[PDB]
Curated annotation (Swiss-Prot), chains A, B, C, D, E, F, G, H, I, J, K, L:
The gene is Saa2. The chain holds residues 20 to 88 of 122 of the full protein. This is Amyloid protein A. It comes from Mus musculus (Mouse). Transmembrane segments: none annotated. It comes from the Eukaryota.
Length: 69, 69, 69, 69, 69, 69, 69, 69, 69, 69, 69, 69
């Protein structure tokens, strides 16, 4: 079992990034979730970058290179 | 089992990025979710970048290269 | 089992990016979801970039290259 | 089993990007979903880029190259 | 069992980054979650960078290199 | 069992970064969570950097190098 | 890269079942190989059985069944 | 990189079941190999059985079954 | 990198079941290999059985079953 | 890097089951290898059994079962 | 790095089951290896049994079961 | 680094079950190895049993069970 959560440059109000992986005879309740935004400036910003999602990189030679100038 | 969640440059109000993977005799309730936005400036912005989604990269030679100038 | 969720430059109100993969005798309820937007400026923006979706890259030589100028 | 969800430059209100892959004797209810937009400017924008969807790239030589000038 | 949560440049109001992995005869309740933002400047900002999500990198030679200039 | 939580550059109000891993006949309640922000300047900021999430790096030669200039 | 060698019921003298998969500036020499057989009884025998050679079986339902009576 | 060698019911004299997978500026020599057999009885024998060679079996339901009576 | 050697019911004289996987500026010599057999009885024998060679079995339900009667 | 050698029911004379995985500026010599057999009875015998060679079994339910009667 | 050697029911004369994994500027010599057998009875015998060779079994439910009657 | 040697029911003459894992500027010599067998009875015998070779078993439920009757 592999679980990898990664969050960047985000604004939230609730109930995020959760992993439930074994749960017998379980019960739960969540409530209301409000996002209210007025008059903001430059919220939720991210620069450049690549996103590599794999289950297994093997014998990667001279690979996975990112250059920023 | 492989689970990979990656979030960037996003604005949210609730109930995001969740993984439930084993659940017998389970029960749950979620509530209302409101997004209210007025008069914002430059929200939810992302720069350049590539998104590679694979299950297995093998013998990648001189590969997976991104250059930014 | 492979599960890869990747989200970028997005604005949301609820119930996103979820993976349920094993669930016997399960039950659930979700609520109303409202998106209300007025007078915004430059929301949900993304720069350039390629999206590679594969199950297996093999012997990729001098491949998968993106240049930004 | 391969599941790859990738979302970019999008605005939403609810119930998106979900994967249910094993579910015996299951039951669920979802609610109403409202999108209300007035007077916005430059919402849901994306730059250039190619979308490669495959199940297996093999011996790709000097391939999969995108140049931006 | 592998669980890796990593959060950066984010603003929140509640109930984030949680892992429940073994829970028999369990029950829980969560409350309302409010995000209220007015008149902010430069919130939720992130610089450049790549995100590598794998389950196993093997024999990576001269790989996984990022240069910032 | 592996559990790794890492948080950076984030502002919060409650109930974050929690791991529950063995819990039989358990019960709990959480309360309301409010985030209220007005007139701030330069909140939730992060510099550059890469995020490597793996379950096992093996024989990595001359790898995993990041240069900042 | 996939390499699967399977040998059964065979008699040999040399230089069998070899896989060379990456070799730059390499050199090698092999010698003479003699098989001499006289007066044997019941050499190199195999019973029944099917040989399935594929690169990927998917959603095989109630399939790949061999019965021996 | 995947390498799987399986040998059964075989008689040999030398230089079998070898995998060379990375070798720069390499050199080697092997010698003569003699098999001499006289008057044997019941050498190199194998019973029944199927040989399944794949690169990936997925969602195989009630499959891959062999019965011996 | 995956290397799996499995040998059964075999008679040998030398230089078998070898894996060389990284070797720069290497050199080696092997000698002569003789197999001499006279008058044997019931050498190199194997009973029934199936040989499954894969790189990844996923969600195999009620599968991979062999019955011997 | 994964290396798994398993040997059963075999008779040998030398230089078997070897793994060399990192070797720069190396050199070696091996000698002659003789197998001489006369008048034996019931050498190199193996009973029934299946051989499963994979790189990763996932969510195997009620699978990989062998019955001997 | 994973190295697993397992030997059963075998007769040998020399130089078996060796793992060399890091060796710079190394040198070695091995000698002659003789197997001489006459008039034996019931040498190198093995009963039933399955051989499972994997790099990672995950969420195996009610699996990997062998019954002997 | 993982090294696991397990030997059962075997007869030998020399130079077995060795692991060399770090050796710079090393040198060695081994000698001749003789196996001489006459008139033996029931040498090198093993009963039933399965051989499981993995690098990581995870969440194995009601698994890895062998019954002998």
């Amino acid at each position: 079992g592999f679980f990898s959560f990664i969050g960047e440059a985000f604004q939230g109000a609730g109930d995020m990034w959760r992993a439930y992986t074994d749960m017998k005879e379980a019960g739960w309740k969540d409530g209301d979730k409000y996002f209210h935004a007025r008059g903001n400036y430059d919220a939720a910003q991210r620069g450049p970058g690549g996103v590599w999602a794999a289950e297994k990189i093997s014998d990667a030679r001279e690979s996975f290179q990112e250059f920023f100038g």
